[PDB]
Every structure is written in structure tokens, then in C-alpha cells.
Amino acid sequence: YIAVPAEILGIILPLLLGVAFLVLAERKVMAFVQRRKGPDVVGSFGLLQPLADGLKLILKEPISPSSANFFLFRMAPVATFMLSLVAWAVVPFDYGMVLSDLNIGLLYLFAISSLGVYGIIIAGRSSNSKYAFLGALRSAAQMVSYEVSIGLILITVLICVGSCNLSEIVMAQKQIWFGIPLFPVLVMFFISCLAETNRAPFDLPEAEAELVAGYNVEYSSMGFALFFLGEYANMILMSGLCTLFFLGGWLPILDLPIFKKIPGSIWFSIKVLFFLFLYIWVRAAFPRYRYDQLMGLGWKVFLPLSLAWVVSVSGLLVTFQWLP
């Protein structure tokens, strides 16, 4: 157990670097779509821009408004940041490359998803601003609404696999990736992940121009940074789940010796990178829904479809006795 901290740090530090550079990559791909260049002055090809923004942020004076909820105001970004970090303990990157081989890892991921709402709720309430509070309530409602669809899709995958172990879920896709028969389920899962991470076209907190003040409007300096970093770490995680559940995790595209020459971590990384490109591509492509429209989509479109897909998959597998 003495080397466990080394493993945990070898997970957490590169994740914080990967998030720093996800912000950069988002600014670069959006720029290129818009015929612009993006950050390219601060470091060669702009590669030192993350470091500069982080150092700027830590050198900013904290504000700490005169609220009766001094402690909760500072604790809310810690809460969300911690929740975003702790989900990676059960994520397998390759065969045997995982910190905790939880037999209940699927339900554990669902539980972390469910805990994610409290940081936003508490930030909104503790800010002593009715705009922040209302924006927070709307964001929390949206998150819990789309968690229902996320959970029912998790149930579909679990029915196919018959085990909550994430490594087992990956290794059950050796015959075929689950995203081929369940391609509509993959589509609905990617959309539900956009709505759960509060990302475009569902990013209410970004719609300040729209008279919608986000839950983190009062935050400055590093609390504001912790909210932003938690949100982006959640996007890489949701891209990793899309990869694990439907694109066969670390497995190669084809069971051929030429494809088995490159290791599984490279396959996993490439699929994660494809999904992160799509998160940015969608932000760059479409306008955003109003709150009532996306709430209607959550309850009236994605709950029914997810439930119907659970019924159809379980019934088809029970009929022909293809169950795990």
C-alpha cells in the first residue's frame, strides 16, 4: 500500500495536464473552424497558454463576498472538483491498467454522476445572488433529468454484459463492439453526456448573453478555476465511458496481428480523442436550446427511448437465450 500514492499521483497529475491541454485543443479546433489561428503566441504553437492562464489565475486576488455562507461558498468548487477526480479510480485504460478493479464499478460511476449536482446547487445558493441561484437550480434540474437516461442506458449495457465490472464490460466486446448493434443507444448516450456536462447545445451557464447568469458567476481566481477544471475533466471521463461501453475500450478495431501490434492504451486514447473532438465539433456547429426545450427533450424523448431500448434488448436476448 506504500506505492499506492505513486499510482494515484500518476493518475491525477497527468489528468490535470490533459485537462489543461483539452482547454487549449478546444480553443484551437474552434479557431480553425472559424478560419482563425487560436492561441499561438504564448509558447510555440501556443503550447504554454495553459500554464500562463493557470499561473495568472493563482496570482489573482480572491474576493470572498460578504455572505453568511463563507464556508460553503469555498467548499462547493472543491466538492465538484473532487467528484470529477475520484471517478477515474475505476477507469481501465488497458488490460490490468486500472487502480481499483471494482465489481460494482458501473453503479459506482452512476453514484458519482448523481453526486455531481451538489457542487452546482451549493455554489448557486451560497452566492447570495438570485441570478446565480436561479441559474443553479436550472442546471441541477437539467443534470438530474438527463441522469435518468444515462442510467437506463447503463442498464442496457449491463444486460448485454451481465457484470458491473468495467474491465469485464470491455472484454465482452471482443466478438463485436456494442456500438454496432446499439448505435442509436450510443447516439443517445453521447447526447445525454453533453447535457450532463452542461455542454453545448445544453450549456445554460454559458448563456450569460441570454439573460441567464450561471451558477459560477460570483466566483473568481481559483474557485472559478476548480469549477472549470471539474467540468472539463468530466468531458474526458464521459468520452472514456462512450469508449469503454460502445467502442470496446482498449481493444483493436480488428482482431488482426497488424492491429494487435500497437498497445491497448493507444487504442483507448484514440477513441477518447475522437469523442473529445466531437464535443468541440458540436460546440462549433449548432446554437443552443432554451431551458424548457432541453427539459422537454430530456423527459419526453430520451427517457422513453432509453426505456424502450432496455425492454427490446432484454426481450431479444431472453427470447433466443443469448444472455451472458
Partner 1 sequence: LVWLEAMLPLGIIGGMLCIMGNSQYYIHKAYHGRPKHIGHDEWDVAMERRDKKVVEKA
Partner 2 sequence: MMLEFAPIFIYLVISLLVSLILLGVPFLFSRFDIRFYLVSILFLIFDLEVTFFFPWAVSLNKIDLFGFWSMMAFLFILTIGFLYEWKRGALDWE
Partner 3 sequence: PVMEKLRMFVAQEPVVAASCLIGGVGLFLPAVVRPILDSLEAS
Ligand X SMILES: COC1=C(OC)C(=O)C(C/C=C(\C)CC/C=C(\C)CC/C=C(\C)CC/C=C(/C)CC/C=C(\C)CC/C=C(\C)CC/C=C(\C)CC/C=C(/C)CCC=C(C)C)=C(C)C1=O
Which residues contact partner 2 (rule: CB under 8 A)?
A: 1, 4-5, 7-9, 11-12, 16, 58-62, 74, 77-78, 81-82, 85-86, 89-90, 99-103, 106-107, 110, 114, 137, 141, 144-145, 147-148, 151-152, 154-155, 158-159, 162-164, 221-223, 225-226, 291-292, 295-296, 299-300, 303, 307, 310-311, 314-315, 317-318, 323-324
| Cα–Cα distance measured from residue 272 to residue 239, given in angstroms and rounded to the nearest whole number | 5
Segments in the chain forming alpha helices (H): 4-33, 49-58, 70-86, 105-115, 117-126, 130-161, 166-171, 183-196, 221-246, 264-285, 291-297, 303-320
Site for ligand X in 50-79 (CB under 6 A): 50-51, 53-55, 57-58
- Closer of 46 and 116 to partner 1 (Cβ): 46
Binder among 168, 201, 222, 314 for partner 1 (CB under 8 A): 168
DSSP 220-236: -HHHHHHHHHHHHHHHH
Nearest residue to 227 via CA among 108, 75, 49: 75
Q: Which does 184 bind (CB under 5 to 8 A by kind): ligand X, partner 1, partner 2, none?
A: none
Binder among 63, 270, 311, 323 for partner 3 (CB under 8 A): 311
Q: Which does 110 bind (CB under 5 to 8 A by kind): partner 3, partner 1, partner 2, none?
A: partner 2
Site track 77-106 with partner 1 (rule: CB under 8 A), x = hit: -----------x---xxxxxxxx-x-----
Supply the minimum distance, in Å, between the C-beta of residue 40 and partner 1: 7
Cβ-proximal residues to 288 (8 Å cutoff; 6+ apart), any chain = 200, 201, 202, 203, 206, 207
Based on the shown chain and the rule CB under 8 A, indicate whether residue 312 belongs to the binding site for partner 3. Answer: yes
> Widest CA span of the chain, in angstroms?
65
Buried b (16+ CB within 10 A) or exposed e, 109-136: bbebbeebbebbbbbbbbbebebbbebb
Cβ-proximal residues to 310 (8 Å cutoff; 6+ apart), any chain = 152, 155, 156, 159
Based on the shown chain and the rule CB under 8 A, indicate whether residue 319 belongs to the binding site for partner 3. Answer: yes
Based on the shown chain and the rule CB under 8 A, indicate whether residue 17 belongs to the binding site for partner 1. Answer: yes
Supply the minimum distance, in Å, between the C-beta of residue 299 and partner 2: 5
Cell of 242: 462512450
Cell of 160: 448485454
| Cα–Cα distance measured from residue 98 to residue 88, given in angstroms and rounded to the nearest whole number | 9
Supply the minimum distance, in Å, between the C-beta of residue 24 and ligand X: 6
Cβ-proximal residues to 89 (8 Å cutoff; 6+ apart), any chain = 8, 11, 99, 100
- Closer of 194 and 212 to partner 3 (Cβ): 194
Based on the shown chain and the rule CB under 8 A, indicate whether residue 293 belongs to the binding site for partner 3. Answer: no
* Identity of the amino acid at 105: G
How big is the site for partner 3, counted in residues (CB under 8 A)? 16
Supply the minimum distance, in Å, between the C-beta of residue 236 and partner 1: 7
Is it true that the peptide bond before 304 is cis, omega within 30 degrees of 0? Answer: no
- Closer of 27 and 114 to ligand X (Cβ): 27
- Closer of 28 and 271 to ligand X (Cβ): 28
Based on the shown chain and the rule CB under 8 A, indicate whether residue 187 belongs to the binding site for partner 3. Answer: no
Residues that bind ligand X (CB under 6 A): 16, 19-20, 23, 50-51, 53-55, 57-58, 224-225, 228-229
Residues near partner 3, by CB under 8 A: 300-301, 304-305, 307-309, 311-316, 318-320
